[PDB]
C-alpha cells in the first residue's frame, strides 16, 4: 500500500489528479456562472 | 631504442569478395593506409569499408583509403580478437610511413622518451583575449 | 610481386597496387581512312590553340547573337513586334 | 535603332558567359 | 461614454446583434418537435443568450460602434471590474501558487536526494504549505523587509 | 518437440516497481541529476533489447504489451459501439440513408461549445462522424441499438479477458524462448485458424444473417418489422423464401453439387445499385473462397508430424550464381530478431493498409459508403497515413537490426553481406533516378507555369497542347473493362465501375462511381507520386545501408543506432545516425502521403463525385476543372487550396467552426516546430542559464537542474509537431470542405 | 597566396570546394585576411566606402536614365492622376503575344514596368518637369560615380 501510494505521489499521476480537480472546478464555475467578462460584485 | 617494422609487400591479403567502399583515386594521386596484423586462426571478420571478411591464419595485410578506416580496424582486432596490429602511409612514390606506435608502445599507456607537443602550462581560462594578439598571426591558445 | 596469390601491394609497382589501368583504352590503330584522317587534320587546324579558340568562339558566339536578335524578323517573335491591339484601361481610370 | 535587342542578350549571355569564364579559369588557377 | 463608446444598454448595435443570434437559434429551432431533447437544448442556448445579453447591458460595459464590449483598462473607476479587480484577484492566485511552490522547494533543499522530492511529491508536507499561500502578501512583504526573499549568493 | 514451454510465476506481481520510476534499466535507476533524465524515461520505457540482453525476457514482455494493446483496442471497439448505441442517430439514419448525416459523438451544453451539436438529420443534434461505423453496422446486419450495446459489452469483456491474458502469460505462466520461436507451428495457426477460420465464420455471419436482413432492408422493409437474424436460424424457411438452395440444406455442398448455391454465391461483380455498394452475395463467396485459400494454405510448414515444410530447408534451397549461398542463414536471423520481423511486418502492413485504402475507394464494400463522401475522403487519407507511418517504421526498426543485432561471425547471411558490399551503386543509382524523376515530373509543372505565365499555352504539357498521355495505365482499364466478355465469362459485371463502360451508380441523386478518366494531368500527379516515393525509399535505404559505417565514420556503428553527430569534424557529421535518416524520411513521407490525398480528393471531386439531376445530367463537385487546372502549380494554389478553404474559413459560427479551430491551432503547431527543427541546443541551455540565474536569486531553483533537450530530442520534438501540425491541416481542411458541401 | 582566394593562406590550400564557397564570404573581412596591418585596414575600408558611392550614385543615373528614355514623365507631369508612371521597358524574347498586350500599360508602344517606387513624385515634386533634365540628372551622376 505504501508503493502504491507512492506511485500516486508520482509526478504524472498526482498531475492529472490536480489538473482534473481543477478543470471540473473550472467547467462547474462556468455552468454555474457563465459568460464572465467583468467583476461586478463590488 | 625501438626500430619500426619493415612492411613486407608479400603479405598474404584476407579472403575478400569484393566491396565498392574500397580505394578510389585518391590511393593513386595521394596516400593510402595499409594495416597489417597476425591472426592465430583463420576467423571472419567486418571489414570497415562494408561487408565481412575472412582473415587467414598468419600475417595479414590490408590497403584501406583512410587513417581512422584503419585505427577501427585495429581497435576492433584488439578489442574482439586481441590481435597485435600496426598500420602505415604509402605515398605513390613509395615512401612507406610508420604510423600508429609512434614508440612501439601505445599511446593510452604512458612510456618514456615522449616530448610534449602542444602543452599549455596553464589553466584553459587564462587564454589571453584576443584583442591583444590582433593584427598579429598568433592565436590566443598558440601563446 | 604483386601478381602472386593473395597478394595485392607492391612496393616497387604502385600502379598496379593502386589500380592505375586503362579499363578500356586500346592500344589499336587508327580505324579512319588515311585521307579521311588528312582532310580533318588540316581543315580543323585554326581551331587547335585553345586560348585563340577561346577568344575566337566567345567573339564569334557574341557576334552572331546580338546580329540574329538585332536583325531577326519582325513576324518571328512576338516581342519584336508591338502589341498591335489597343491599350486598356486600368482599374481606377488609369491610375 | 532598338537598343534592347543587342544589350539584353549581351548582358543576359554574352557578358555571363565571359564573367563565369574568366572567374573558373581564375578560381582554378595554380600560381 | 469614454473614448466615444456607448453603453451596451443603450445600444442599438448591441440589440440588433442579439436579435440575429436568437433569429439563427429560431431558424435552428423550427427544424424539430418542442417537446423534443434539441429543441429543450435549444430554448436553454436562447435564454442563455438573452441572460448574457442582459447582464452585459447592465453590468456597465461600454459597447462599441460594432455592437460589441470594450474593455477600459486605463483605470477609471466605473470599469474597475473590468480589468483592476480581476487583475488583483490573479495576483493573489498566482502568488498563492508561487509562494506554495517556493516554500515546497526550500522545505526539501536540505535532504539527502532533493530530486526525488521533485519527481515524486511528499504530498503532506505539500498539503501542509498550501494554506501558506493564503497570508502569501504579508509573508512576502515581511521576508523583503527581512532580506530573505533574495539571495546574494 | 513443438510443445507448450511455459514457466510458472517468473515476475512477481507487486508495486515496488511502480514507486521507482526507471527501474528498467540500470544508469535511469539512479535518480534524477537533470532534467534530462524525465525525458531519458520515456525513451528507453520500451526499448526492450536495451533493458536486458536475454530474448526470454524480451519475448515474455512483447507477448504482454501485444496483449495489452490488445485490450486497448477492444476498449476503443467497446466505445464507437456504445457511443453508437447511445448518442447516435443510427436507427434514423437506417430508414433515410440518403438523407441524414451520420453521428455518434454529442458534446455537453458547456462555454457555448453546443454550437457543435449540429443538425445532421433524423431529429438529432450532435457531431457528424466520418468512420464509415453507420455502413459497417448495416452490412453485419444490425438494426436495433440493444445489438451495439451488447456488442458494446462483449468488446469490454474481451478487454479485460485481453488484460488478465496479457497479465498472466508475463506474471503467472510465461511462455520459454523455443515457444515463440516455433515460427513454423505460428504460421500454421494464424493461416488456418485465425485468418481462414475467421473468414469462414465471418462468411458464415454473412450468409445466415447479413444476407437476409439486407435483402429486407433493399426490400424496403421498416427495420423494426424485419424478423430477428436469430429468427432466420431457426426458421430454415424464412431464408429458405429469400434463397430457394436453402431448402436443399448442406447436401447440395458434401455432393459437390455446389452450382445449386448460385443464388446466395454469385459472382457478380460491380456495384448494388439499391445501395452503391458491393454485392454482399460476392463478399460471401469471397470470404468463403478466401477461407478455404487460407486453410488448404495454413497445412504448410511441418510440425510434430513428419509431413509439411521446413523453413529452414525452402530458404536454403534457393541459392543462385549471382547470389552465392543465397539465403542460406536468414532463418536464424529472423528467430533471433524481433526488429528484423518488426522491419518486415510494418513494411507489409503499410503497403496493405494502402492497397486497402485504395480497394476501398475503388470498390465500396458497405451499403451507402460511396454516396458518404466524407467517409470516403476520411478512409482513404486515413489509411494512406497510416501506411505511410508503418513503411517509415519499417526502414526505422531495420537500421535497429543493423546496429544492434547484425554481426557476421554468427548468424551470416550471403544475401545481405552481398547488399553491403555494393551499397554504394545502390545509393547512387536511387540517387540519378530521383533527380531524373524530379526534373522530368516538377519541371514539366514549372514548364506548365511559365508557358501559362507568359501567355504561350500551346506550349504546355496540356490535353489541348503537348500530350503525355497514360497509354499503359488506359490500356490496363480497357483490358478491365471487357473483362466480362473473354477473360473473366464467369462475372456478370467489370470488379469496378472505374475503368470503362457507360455504367454508371447513383444512390439517392448523388454519384457512387464513375469510369475515371486518365489524362495527361494524372500522369503528371502519378510520376510526382514515382519520384515523392523514390526519395523516400532513398533517405531510408541510405539510413539502413548506412547504419553501420561509411567512407566518412568507419566506426558508426559503435555511436549507436540513434546519436546525435560525431563533432563538427571531417567538415561536420550533423545527423550521420539512421535515426535522423528516419527523421528526415518522415517529412518525405508526409510530402507524398499529402500529395497522393490531394490528388485523390482533386480528383474524385471533379471527375467522379457530383450529383444526378432527374433528366440524366451530371454535375462535379468542382465542375470538371482538374484536366486544365492541375497541370500547374498555380492551379493547385488557386482552384484546390485557395478555392476549397473557403469552407474550413468560413466555418466560424456553425456547427463546423471546430474544424476551423483546428485549421489555426495545425497551422499554429506546424509552424511552432520550426522552432525545434531549426535551432540548436546551445543557445537555448545558454538562456536557461539566465533563468536559472533569476530562478536563485530568489531561492526558488529547482535541484532538477533545469537542461535544454538533447540535440536527438529536438530534431524529434520538431519533426513530431510538423507531422502532427501539417496533418491536423489537411484533416480539418478535407473534413470541414466535404462535409459542407458532400 | 598562390590561390584563391589570395588573401587567406588557409582557405587557398584547401582541396575542397568549400574554398570557393568561403573566399567568398569571407572577401570583406578584411581583419581576419592574412598580414593585414591597422593602416592598411583602415585604407582599404576607405576605398570601398568611395566604390559603395560610385555605385549608389550609378545606379540613381540608371533610375532616371531608364525614367527619361522609356517611362511617361512628361505626360504623367501633365496629368499626375489617372496616368500610371513606368519604370522602365521590358523585352523579353521568351514572351508571348498575350504577354505583350497584357504589360503595354501608359502611353508606350511596348511591353513596360508600372513604376511603384514613387520617383515620379519627387522629382516632380523637386523642380524636374521635362526628360532633358532627367538626362542631365544621370549624366551629373554618372559624372558623381566617376569622380
Ligand atoms: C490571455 C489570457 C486569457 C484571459 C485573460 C481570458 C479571459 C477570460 N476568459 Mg478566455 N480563453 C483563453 C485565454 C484567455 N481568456 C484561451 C487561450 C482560450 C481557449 C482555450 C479561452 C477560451 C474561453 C472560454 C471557452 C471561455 C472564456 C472565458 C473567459 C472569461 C473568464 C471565465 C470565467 O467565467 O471565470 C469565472 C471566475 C473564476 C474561475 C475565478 C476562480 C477563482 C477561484 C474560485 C478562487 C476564488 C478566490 C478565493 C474571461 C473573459 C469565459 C467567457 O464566458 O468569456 C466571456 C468562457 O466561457 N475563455
Ligand atoms: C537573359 C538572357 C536570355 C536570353 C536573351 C534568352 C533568349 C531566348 N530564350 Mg532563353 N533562357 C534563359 C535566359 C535567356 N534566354 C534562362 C536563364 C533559361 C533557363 C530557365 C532559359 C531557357 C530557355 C529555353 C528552354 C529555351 C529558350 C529559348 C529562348 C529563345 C526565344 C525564342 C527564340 O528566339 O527562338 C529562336 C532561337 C534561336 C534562333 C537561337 C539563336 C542562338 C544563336 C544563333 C546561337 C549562336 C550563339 C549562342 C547565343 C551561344 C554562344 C554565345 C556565348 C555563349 C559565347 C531566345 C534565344 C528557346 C531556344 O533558344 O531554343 C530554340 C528555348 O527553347 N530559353
Ligand atoms: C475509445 C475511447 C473512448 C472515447 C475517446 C470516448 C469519448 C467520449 N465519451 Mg465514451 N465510452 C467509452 C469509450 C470512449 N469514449 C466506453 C468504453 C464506454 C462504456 C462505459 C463509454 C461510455 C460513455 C458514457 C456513458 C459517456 C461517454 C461520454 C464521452 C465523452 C467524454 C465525457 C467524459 O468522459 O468526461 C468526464 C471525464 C472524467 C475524467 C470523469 C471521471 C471518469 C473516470 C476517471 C473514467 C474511467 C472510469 C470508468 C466523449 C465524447 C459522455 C457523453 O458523451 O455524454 C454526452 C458520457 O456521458 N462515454
Ligand atoms: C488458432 C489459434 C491461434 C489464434 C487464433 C491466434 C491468434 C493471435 N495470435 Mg497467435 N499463436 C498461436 C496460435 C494462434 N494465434 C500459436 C500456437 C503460437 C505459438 C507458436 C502463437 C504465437 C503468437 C505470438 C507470439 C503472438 C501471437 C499473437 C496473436 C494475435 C495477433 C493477431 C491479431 O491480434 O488479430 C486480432 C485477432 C483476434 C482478436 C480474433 C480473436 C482471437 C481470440 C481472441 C484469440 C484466442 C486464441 C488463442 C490462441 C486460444 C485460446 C487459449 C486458451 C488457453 C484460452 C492473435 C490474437 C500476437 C499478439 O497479439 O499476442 C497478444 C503475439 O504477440 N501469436
Ligand atoms: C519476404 C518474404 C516474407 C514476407 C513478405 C513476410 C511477411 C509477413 N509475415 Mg513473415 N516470415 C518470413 C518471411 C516473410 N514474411 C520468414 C522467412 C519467416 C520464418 C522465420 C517468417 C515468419 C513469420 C511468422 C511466424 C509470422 C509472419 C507473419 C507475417 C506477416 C505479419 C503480419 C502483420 O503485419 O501483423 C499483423 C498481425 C499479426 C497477424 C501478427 C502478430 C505478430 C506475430 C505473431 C509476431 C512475429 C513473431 C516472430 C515469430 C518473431 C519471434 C522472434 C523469436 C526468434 C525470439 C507479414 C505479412 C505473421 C503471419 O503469418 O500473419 C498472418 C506470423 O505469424 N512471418
Ligand atoms: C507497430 C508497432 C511498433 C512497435 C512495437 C515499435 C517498437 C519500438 N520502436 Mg519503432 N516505429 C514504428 C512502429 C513500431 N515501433 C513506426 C510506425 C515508426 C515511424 C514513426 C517507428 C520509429 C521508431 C523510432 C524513430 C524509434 C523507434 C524505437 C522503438 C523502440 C522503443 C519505443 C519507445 O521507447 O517509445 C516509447 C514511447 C514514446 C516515446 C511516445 C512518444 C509520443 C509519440 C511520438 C506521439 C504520438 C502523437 C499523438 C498521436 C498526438 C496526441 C497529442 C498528445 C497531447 C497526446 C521499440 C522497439 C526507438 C528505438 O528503438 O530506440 C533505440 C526509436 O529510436 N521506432
Ligand atoms: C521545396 C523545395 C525543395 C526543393 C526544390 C528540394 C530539392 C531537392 N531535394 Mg530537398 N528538402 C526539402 C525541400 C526541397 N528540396 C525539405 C523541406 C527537406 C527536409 C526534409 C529536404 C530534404 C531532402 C532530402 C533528405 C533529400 C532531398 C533531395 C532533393 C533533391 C532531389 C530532387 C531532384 O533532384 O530533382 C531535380 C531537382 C529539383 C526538382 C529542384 C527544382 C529544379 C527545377 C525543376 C528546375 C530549375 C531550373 C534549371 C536548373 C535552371 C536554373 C536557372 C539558372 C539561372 C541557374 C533536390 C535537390 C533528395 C536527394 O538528394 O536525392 C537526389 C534527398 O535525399 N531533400
Ligand atoms: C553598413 C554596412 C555594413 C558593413 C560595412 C558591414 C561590415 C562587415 N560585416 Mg556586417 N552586417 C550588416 C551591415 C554591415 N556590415 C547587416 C545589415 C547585417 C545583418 C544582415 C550584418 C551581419 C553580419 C554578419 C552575420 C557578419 C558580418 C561581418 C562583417 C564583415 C563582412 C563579411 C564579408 O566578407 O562579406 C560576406 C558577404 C557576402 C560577400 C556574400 C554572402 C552573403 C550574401 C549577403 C547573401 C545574401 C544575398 C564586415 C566586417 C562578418 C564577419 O565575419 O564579422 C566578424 C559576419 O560574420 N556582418
Ligand atoms: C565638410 C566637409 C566634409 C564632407 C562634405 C564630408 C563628407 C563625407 N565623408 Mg567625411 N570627413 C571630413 C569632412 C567632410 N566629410 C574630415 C575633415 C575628415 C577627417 C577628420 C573626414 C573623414 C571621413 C572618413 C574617414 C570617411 C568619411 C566619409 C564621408 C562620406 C560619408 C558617406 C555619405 O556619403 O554620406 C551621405 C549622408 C548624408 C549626405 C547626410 C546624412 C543622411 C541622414 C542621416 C539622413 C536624413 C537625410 C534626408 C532625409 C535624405 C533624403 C533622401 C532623398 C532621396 C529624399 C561623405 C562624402 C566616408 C567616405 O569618405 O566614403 C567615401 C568615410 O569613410 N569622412
Ligand atoms: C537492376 C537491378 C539488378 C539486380 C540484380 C540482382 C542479382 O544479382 O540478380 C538476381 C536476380 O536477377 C534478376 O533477374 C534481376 C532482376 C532485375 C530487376 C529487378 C526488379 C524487378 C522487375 C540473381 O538471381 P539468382 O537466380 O542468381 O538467385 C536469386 C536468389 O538468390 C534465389 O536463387
Not at chain 3, 24 to 50: H, I, M
Not at chain 5, 131 to 147: D, H, I, K, Q, T
Not at chain 6, 160 to 168: C, E
Request: hydrophobic share 45%; charged share 15%.
Amino acid at each position: 500500500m505504501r508503493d502504491f501510494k507512492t506511485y500516486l505521489s508520482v509526478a504524472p499521476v498526482l498531475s492529472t489528479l490536480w489538473f482534473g480537480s481543477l478543470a471540473g472546478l473550472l467547467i462547474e464555475i462556468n455552468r454555474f456562472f457563465p459568460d464572465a467578462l467583468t467583476f461586478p460584485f463590488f | 631504442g625501438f626500430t619500426p617494422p619493415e612492411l613486407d609487400p608479400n603479405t598474404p591479403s584476407p579472403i575478400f569478395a569484393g566491396s565498392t567502399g574500397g580505394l578510389l583515386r585518391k590511393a593513386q594521386v595521394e596516400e593510402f593506409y595499409v594495416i597489417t596484423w597476425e591472426s592465430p586462426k583463420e576467423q571472419i571478420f567486418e571489414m570497415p569499408t562494408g561487408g565481412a571478411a575472412i582473415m587467414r591464419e598468419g600475417p595479414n595485410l590490408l590497403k584501406l583509403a583512410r587513417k581512422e578506416q584503419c585505427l577501427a580496424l585495429g581497435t576492433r582486432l584488439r578489442s574482439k580478437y586481441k590481435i597485435k596490429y600496426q598500420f602505415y602511409r604509402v605515398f605513390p612514390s613509395g615512401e612507406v610511413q610508420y604510423l600508429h606506435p609512434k614508440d612501439g608502445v601505445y599511446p593510452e599507456k604512458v612510456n618514456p622518451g615522449r616530448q610534449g607537443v602542444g602543452l599549455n602550462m596553464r589553466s584553459i581560462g587564462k587564454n589571453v583575449s584576443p584583442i591583444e594578439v590582433k593584427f598579429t598571426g598568433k592565436q590566443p591558445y598558440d601563446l | 610481386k604483386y601478381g602472386d596469390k593473395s597478394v595485392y601491394f607492391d612496393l616497387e609497382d604502385i600502379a598496379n597496387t593502386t589500380g592505375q589501368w586503362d579499363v578500356y583504352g586500346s592500344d589499336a590503330p587508327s580505324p579512319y581512312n588515311s585521307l579521311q584522317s588528312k582532310f580533318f587534320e588540316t581543315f580543323a587546324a585554326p581551331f587547335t590553340k585553345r586560348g585563340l579558340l577561346l577568344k575566337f568562339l566567345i567573339l564569334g558566339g557574341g557576334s552572331l547573337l546580338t546580329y540574329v536578335s538585332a536583325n531577326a524578323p519582325q513576324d518571328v517573335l512576338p516581342i519584336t513586334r508591338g502589341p498591335q491591339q489597343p491599350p486598356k484601361l486600368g482599374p481606377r481610370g488609369k491610375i | 535603332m532598338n537598343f534592347p535587342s543587342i544589350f539584353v542578350p549581351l548582358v543576359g549571355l554574352v557578358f555571363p558567359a565571359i564573367a563565369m569564364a574568366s572567374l573558373f579559369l581564375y578560381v582554378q588557377k595554380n600560381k | 461614454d469614454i473614448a466615444g463608446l456607448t453603453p451596451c444598454k443603450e445600444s442599438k448595435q448591441f440589440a440588433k446583434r442579439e436579435k440575429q443570434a436568437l433569429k439563427k437559434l429560431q431558424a435552428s429551432l423550427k427544424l424539430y418537435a418542442d417537446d423534443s431533447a434539441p429543441a429543450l437544448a435549444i430554448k436553454a442556448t436562447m435564454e442563455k443568450t438573452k441572460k448574457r445579453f442582459d447582464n452585459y447591458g447592465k453590468y456597465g460595459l461600454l459597447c462599441g460602434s460594432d455592437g460589441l464590449p470594450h474593455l477600459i483598462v486605463s483605470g477609471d473607476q466605473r470599469h474597475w471590474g473590468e480589468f483592476i479587480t480581476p487583475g488583483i484577484l490573479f495576483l493573489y492566485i498566482a502568488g498563492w501558487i508561487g509562494w506554495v511552490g517556493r516554500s515546497y522547494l526550500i522545505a526539501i533543499r536540505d535532504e539527502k536526494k532533493p530530486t526525488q522530492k521533485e519527481i515524486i511529491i511528499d504530498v503532506p508536507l505539500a498539503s501542509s504549505l498550501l494554506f501558506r499561500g493564503f497570508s502569501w502578501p504579508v509573508a512576502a512583504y515581511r521576508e523583503l523587509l527581512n532580506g530573505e526573499l533574495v539571495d546574494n549568493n | 518437440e513443438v510443445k507448450i514451454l511455459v514457466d510458472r510465476d517468473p515476475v512477481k506481481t507487486s508495486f515496488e516497481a511502480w514507486a521507482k520510476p526507471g527501474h528498467f534499466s540500470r544508469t535511469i535507476a539512479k535518480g534524477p541529476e537533470t532534467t534530462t533524465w524525465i525525458w531519458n524515461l520515456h525513451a528507453d520505457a520500451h526499448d526492450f533489447d536495451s533493458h536486458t540482453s536475454d530474448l526470454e525476457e524480451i519475448s515474455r514482455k512483447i507477448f504482454s504489451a501485444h496483449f495489452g494493446q490488445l485490450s486497448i483496442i477492444f476498449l476503443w471497439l467497446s466505445g464507437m459501439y456504445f457511443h453508437g448505441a447511445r448518442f447516435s442517430n443510427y436507427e434514423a439514419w437506417l430508414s433515410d440513408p440518403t438523407h441524414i448525416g451520420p453521428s455518434a459523438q454529442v458534446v455537453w451544453p458547456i462555454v457555448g461549445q453546443e454550437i457543435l451539436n449540429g443538425d445532421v438529420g433524423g431529429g438529432f443534434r450532435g457531431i457528424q462522424i466520418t468512420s464509415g461505423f453507420f455502413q459497417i453496422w448495416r452490412a453485419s446486419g444490425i438494426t436495433s441499438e440493444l445489438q451495439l450495446y451488447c456488442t458494446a459489452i462483449g468488446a469490454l469483456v474481451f478487454a479485460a479477458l485481453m488484460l488478465f491474458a496479457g497479465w498472466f502469460h508475463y506474471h503467472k505462466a510465461a511462455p520459454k524462448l523455443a515457444w515463440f520461436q516455433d515460427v513454423e507451428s505460428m504460421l500454421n495457426h494464424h493461416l488456418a485458424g485465425l485468418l481462414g477460420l475467421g473468414s469462414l465464420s465471418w462468411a458464415g455471419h454473412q450468409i445466415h444473417v447479413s444476407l437476409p436482413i439486407n435483402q429486407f432492408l433493399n426490400a424496403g422493409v421498416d427495420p423494426k418489422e424485419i424478423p430477428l437474424p436469430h429468427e432466420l436460424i431457426l426458421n430454415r424457411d424464412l431464408l429458405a423464401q429469400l434463397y430457394p438452395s436453402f431448402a436443399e440444406g448442406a447436401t447440395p455442398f458434401f455432393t459437390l453439387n455446389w452450382s445449386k448455391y448460385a443464388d446466395f454465391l454469385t459472382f457478380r461483380g460491380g456495384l448494388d445499385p439499391v445501395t452503391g455498394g458491393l454485392w454482399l452475395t460476392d463478399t460471401a463467396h469471397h470470404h468463403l473462397a478466401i477461407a478455404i485459400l487460407f486453410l488448404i494454405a495454413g497445412h504448410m510448414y511441418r510440425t510434430n508430424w513428419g509431413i509439411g515444410h521446413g523453413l529452414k530447408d525452402i530458404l536454403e534451397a534457393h541459392k543462385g550464381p549471382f547470389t552465392g549461398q543465397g539465403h542460406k542463414g536468414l532463418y536464424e536471423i529472423l528467430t533471433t530478431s524481433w526488429h528484423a520481423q518488426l522491419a518486415l511486418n510494418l513494411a507489409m502492413l503499410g503497403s496493405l493498409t494502402i492497397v486497402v485504402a485504395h480497394h476501398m475507394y475503388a470498390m465500396p464494400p458497405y451499403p451507402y459508403l460511396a454516396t458518404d463522401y466524407g467517409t470516403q475522403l476520411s478512409l482513404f487519407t486515413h489509411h494512406m497515413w497510416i501506411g505511410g507511418f508503418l513503411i517509415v517504421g519499417a526502414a526505422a526498426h531495420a537500421a535497429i537490426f543493423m546496429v544492434r543485432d547484425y554481426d557476421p561471425t554468427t548468424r551470416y547471411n550471403d544475401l545481405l553481406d552481398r547488399v553491403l558490399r555494393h551499397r554504394d551503386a545502390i545509393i547512387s543509382h536511387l540517387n540519378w533516378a530521383c533527380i531524373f524523376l524530379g526534373f522530368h515530373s516538377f519541371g514539366l509543372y514549372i514548364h506548365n507555369d511559365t508557358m501559362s505565365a507568359l501567355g504561350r499555352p500551346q506550349d504546355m504539357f496540356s490535353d489541348t497542347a503537348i500530350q503525355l498521355q497514360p497509354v499503359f495505365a488506359q490500356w490496363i482499364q480497357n483490358t478491365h473493362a471487357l473483362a466480362p466478355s473473354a477473360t473473366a465469362p464467369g462475372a456478370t459485371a467489370s470488379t469496378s465501375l472505374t475503368w470503362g463502360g457507360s455504367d454508371l451508380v447513383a444512390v439517392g441523386g448523388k454519384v457512387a462511381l464513375l469510369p475515371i478518366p486518365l489524362g495527361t494531368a494524372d500522369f503528371l500527379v502519378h510520376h510526382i507520386h514515382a519520384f515523392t516515393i523514390h526519395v523516400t525509399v532513398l533517405i531510408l535505404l541510405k539510413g539502413v545501408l548506412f547504419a553501420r559505417s561509411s567512407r566518412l565514420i568507419p566506426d558508426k556503428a559503435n555511436l549507436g543506432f540513434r546519436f546525435p553527430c560525431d563533432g563538427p569534424g571531417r567538415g561536420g557529421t550533423c545527423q550521420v545516425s539512421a535515426w535522423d535518416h528516419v527523421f528526415l524520411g518522415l517529412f518525405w513521407m508526409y510530402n507524398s502521403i499529402s500529395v497522393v490525398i490531394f490528388h485523390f480528393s482533386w480528383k474524385m471531386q471533379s471527375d467522379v463525385w457530383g450529383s444526378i439531376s432527374d433528366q440524366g445530367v451530371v454535375t462535379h463537385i468542382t465542375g470538371g476543372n482538374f484536366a486544365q487546372s492541375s497541370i500547374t502549380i498555380n492551379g493547385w494554389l488557386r482552384d484546390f487550396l485557395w478555392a476549397q478553404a473557403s469552407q474550413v474559413i468560413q466555418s466560424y459560427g456553425s456547427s463546423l467552426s471546430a474544424y476551423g479551430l483546428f485549421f489555426l491551432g495545425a497551422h499554429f503547431v506546424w509552424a511552432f516546430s520550426l522552432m525545434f527543427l531549426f535551432s540548436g541546443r546551445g543557445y537555448w541551455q545558454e538562456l536557461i542559464e539566465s533563468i536559472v540565474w533569476a530562478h536563485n536569486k530568489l531561492k526558488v531553483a529547482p535541484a532538477t537542474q533545469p537542461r535544454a533537450l538533447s540535440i536527438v530530442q529536438g530534431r524529434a520534438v520538431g519533426v513530431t509537431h510538423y507531422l502532427l501540425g501539417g496533418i491536423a491541416t489537411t484533416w480539418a481542411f478535407f473534413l470541414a470542405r466535404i462535409i459542407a458541401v458532400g | 597566396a598562390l590561390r584563391f582566394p589570395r588573401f587567406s593562406q588557409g582557405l587557398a590550400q584547401d582541396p575542397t570546394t568549400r574554398r570557393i564557397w568561403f573566399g567568398i564570404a569571407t572577401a570583406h573581412d578584411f581583419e581576419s585576411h592574412d598580414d593585414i596591418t591597422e593602416e592598411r585596414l583602415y585604407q582599404n575600408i576607405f576605398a570601398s566606402h568611395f566604390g559603395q558611392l560610385a555605385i549608389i550614385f550609378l545606379w540613381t543615373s540608371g533610375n532616371l536614365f531608364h525614367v527619361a528614355w522609356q517611362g511617361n514623365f512628361e505626360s504623367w507631369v501633365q496629368d499626375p492622376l489617372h496616368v500610371r508612371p513606368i519604370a522602365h521597358a521590358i523585352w523579353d524574347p521568351h514572351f508571348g503575344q498575350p504577354a505583350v498586350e497584357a504589360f503595354t500599360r501608359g502611353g508606350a508602344l511596348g511591353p513596360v514596368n508600372i513604376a511603384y517606387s514613387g520617383v515620379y513624385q519627387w522629382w516632380y515634386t523637386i523642380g524636374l518637369r521635362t526628360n532633358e533634365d532627367l538626362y542631365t540628372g544621370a549624366l551629373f551622376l554618372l559624372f558623381l560615380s566617376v569622380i
